[PDB]
Amino acid sequence: SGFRKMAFPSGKVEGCMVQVTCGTTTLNGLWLDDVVYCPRHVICTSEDMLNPNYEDLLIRKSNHNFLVQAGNVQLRVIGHSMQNCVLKLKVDTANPKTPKYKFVRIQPGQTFSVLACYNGSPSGVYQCAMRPNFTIKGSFLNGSCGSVGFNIDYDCVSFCYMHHMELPTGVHAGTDLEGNFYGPFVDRQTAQAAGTDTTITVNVLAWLYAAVINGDRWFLNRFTTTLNDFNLVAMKYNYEPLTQDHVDILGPLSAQTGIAVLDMCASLKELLQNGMNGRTILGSALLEDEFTPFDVVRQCSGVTF
Amino acid sequence: SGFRKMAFPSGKVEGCMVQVTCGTTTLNGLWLDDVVYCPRHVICTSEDMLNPNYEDLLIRKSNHNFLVQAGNVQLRVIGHSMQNCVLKLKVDTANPKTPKYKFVRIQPGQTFSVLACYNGSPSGVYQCAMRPNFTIKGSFLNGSCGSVGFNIDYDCVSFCYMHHMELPTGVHAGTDLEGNFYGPFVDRQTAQAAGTDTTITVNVLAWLYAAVINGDRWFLNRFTTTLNDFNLVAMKYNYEPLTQDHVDILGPLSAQTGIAVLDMCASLKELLQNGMNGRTILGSALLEDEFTPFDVVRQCSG
């Protein structure tokens, strides 16, 4: 019993975190094989960030301008190239701790673990979801750039996020490991804002199934709904549309608890129109949307890595 | 910016998790140097659990009755001793991945990261606190026994908890790494129950200071309170008494925000009276009590 916001074990990722310094800017890099990946804005000064020409700024740098520190060992940079918003620093030494890995681009609603780092040193691990507005509600201070997001499937680490910036509302923006931003963001000091966010409907439903598995049933009712009626209601509360794929994905949880996906949608509909009425669900007074259906199955079954 | 429930990076602890098997019982062990620590109930059968005589059950076991698996490598048990509710299995190989570590016994209100494991394999990491009733609100299924709680301050892993039991309310009980249970719990299947739980007041105050540091001030008020008047109100909402030690501990956060501890206590009193009125504090509609003053400083400053 118990339901916690749980991150993947961060060990396989901790063995890849390095410090990257270029001039006065220090941030984090991900050392996989003989390449260190980091935000390309490490080459920029505060004045450069206003309007940077990254090819022009990069062509002026030599390998020795990048200081890469792996623990108390300085790695030697033997090449450098840019891929979208990520800088790839070729180093002489392959990381002996390189795990089996993939670079995956995730969709909004998908969750991942973030290993927050400062000066190439991991300080914390937390779980978060890629919001529908492509931001993440992370916890990052100055120097956290280059910290990464990941999922671990079997023994393979799928790197899905690299931290680049904080928006004025305190939320965060970054890229996949191929340097493509999630969202309409750019790595430039200019007016940028997170768009209107929505709630991840399939995730709230997954978390309602987690509450039922853990003995919380007060929100259940005799009612069912149609997918179309539920979406008409959901749109009204800034909830993402629920598709047939979401209903299919919730199938296993629907079979385990005996509550049909549209039966649980009628609970969610009632919760949106009437509130919790002083009650909580899994120790929360808000409907939680940062657990996917797969996270619920993994935690309520104990999958290991 | 941002305030998350943050766990410590679990890598240093993952390299210590082993599987311990004794007969039909399989659970987790913590391999540090040449010793594997695990709950002593690994020697029990489901029937032995009502009234086990651990010294009598242990004296019947030899080293080869304990199968210790570190990854795909079987370790050789060369000794065994019991220390309170922990079984210490001496093994013939020191863990090459043994980090710099300490065994620390924590007080209620303290937080730590849990590396939940099954069959010596880590499955997840989460943050939690030692409740005032000495239980932890963890996420543990059958086979999670032996999973550990820890903090990492600097490069040293301080092991503070080892999981042993799930109480009937779904909450969890365990020991420090010297085998002393937190709370009035015993490693027996006799009727046991978590005492009435309360909110960790100093932690809610720390989290209110975290909200102020992150720009949330809506809950502040022009009022102050005496420590005694605050406690009289706090007791009525099942909040732990706030001691002068707690007020002193909140000193740094008070100095950083410019809000006196007793002024923050007056905001809390008002929050308890009014609720949040549709508002949130750091993305939460409930008053959070699983962040200590130390956690707030660490996450907001460094």
Ligand SMILES: CO[C@@]1(C(=O)Nc2cncc3ccc(F)cc23)CCOc2ccc(Cl)cc21
């Ligand atoms: C690299 O610095 C920028 C940045 O957002 N940094 C930060 C990232 N995360 C957390 C932060 C917390 C506090 C803080 F002062 C800065 C943070 C701030 C300057 O403008 C820009 C413009 C574009 C880009 Cl892609 C990055 C940056």
Ligand SMILES: CO[C@@]1(C(=O)Nc2cncc3ccc(F)cc23)CCOc2ccc(Cl)cc21
């Ligand atoms: C060691 O087994 C006991 C136990 O609480 N196990 C569990 C621990 N954690 C999570 C669990 C989730 C589900 C479950 F069925 C059992 C769990 C089972 C009940 O009797 C006792 C009596 C005393 C002690 Cl110290 C332990 C135990």
Ligand SMILES: [Cl-]
């Ligand atoms: Cl303590």
